[PDB]
C-alpha cells in the first residue's frame, strides 16, 4: 500500500486525472458513467471512474507544490502512464484570458522547491504533446473555446511588501497563467518517463465543460493500454 495514497500498485490505472480539491473528485466521480471510491487519506482522494468504456484513476493531490510531489511520486513510481491535471488557476494576460476561460498549458515556470531538488533549475517543466494535442482535440470536437499557454507555477499565494513578486515579470514574458502545481506534475512526469499534461479553468457551467475536457482525454488516452 503506498504510504500517502493508501490505495495498491495494483489499484494504479495507466492514465490519472489529478485535481487538488478531494470535494472536485466527488463532483467528477458523478458525471461519469459510474465509479468505484478507493481511499480517502489526509488530502488524498481515490476514486475509479469508469467512462465511455475505459478505466482511470481519479486522484486528489491537495494544495501547493511539496504535498501533490507525493501523490504524483506515488503514482509515477508505481505504474501511471499518463497523469492530467485538471484545476484552477488565475489570469496573467487580463483582458484576454478572462474569468471563466480554459487554458490547456504545455509548459510551466518553476516556482518551486522540490522540482529544483530533483533536477537543476535550467531544465524545462513541459508537458508531453501527446497529452496537450489529445486535451485539444477534446476541446475541439465539445466546442469549447479554450486557451494556450505557460502556467506560472508558484508555491506563494499570499504575497508580502517586501520581496517583489515575479507574476508581471512573468505576465510581460508572456505566461499565460498563475496555478501551484503543474511545473512539479511536469518536471516529476519527465524524469519518471510518464506523460503529463494541464486544463485549468481560470478563476481569479465552464466547470461541467473544463471536466468534460480532461474525461474525454482521459478515455481517449486510457484506449492505448
Known sequence: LLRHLKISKEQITPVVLVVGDPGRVDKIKVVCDSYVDLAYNREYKSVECHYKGQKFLCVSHGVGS????????????????????????????????????????????????????????????????????????????????????????????????????????????NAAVVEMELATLMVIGTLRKVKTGGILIVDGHQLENMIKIALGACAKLATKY
Open 66 to 173: 511539496a504535498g501533490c510531489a507525493v501523490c504524483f511520486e506515488e503514482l509515477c513510481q508505481n505504474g501511471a502512464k499518463v497523469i492530467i491535471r485538471a484545476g484552477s488557476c488565475g489570469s496573467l494576460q487580463p483582458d484576454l484570458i478572462k474569468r471563466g476561460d480554459i487554458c490547456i498549458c504545455n509548459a510551466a515556470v518553476r516556482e518551486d522547491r522540490v522540482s529544483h531538488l530533483l533536477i537543476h533549475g535550467d531544465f524545462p517543466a513541459v508537458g508531453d504533446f501527446d497529452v496537450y494535442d489529445t486535451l485539444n482535440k477534446c476541446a475541439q470536437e465539445l466546442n469549447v473555446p479554450v486557451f494556450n499557454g505557460i502556467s506560472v507555477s508558484s508555491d506563494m499565494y499570499y504575497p508580502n511588501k517586501i520581496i517583489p513578486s515575479r507574476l508581471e515579470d512573468y505576465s510581460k514574458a
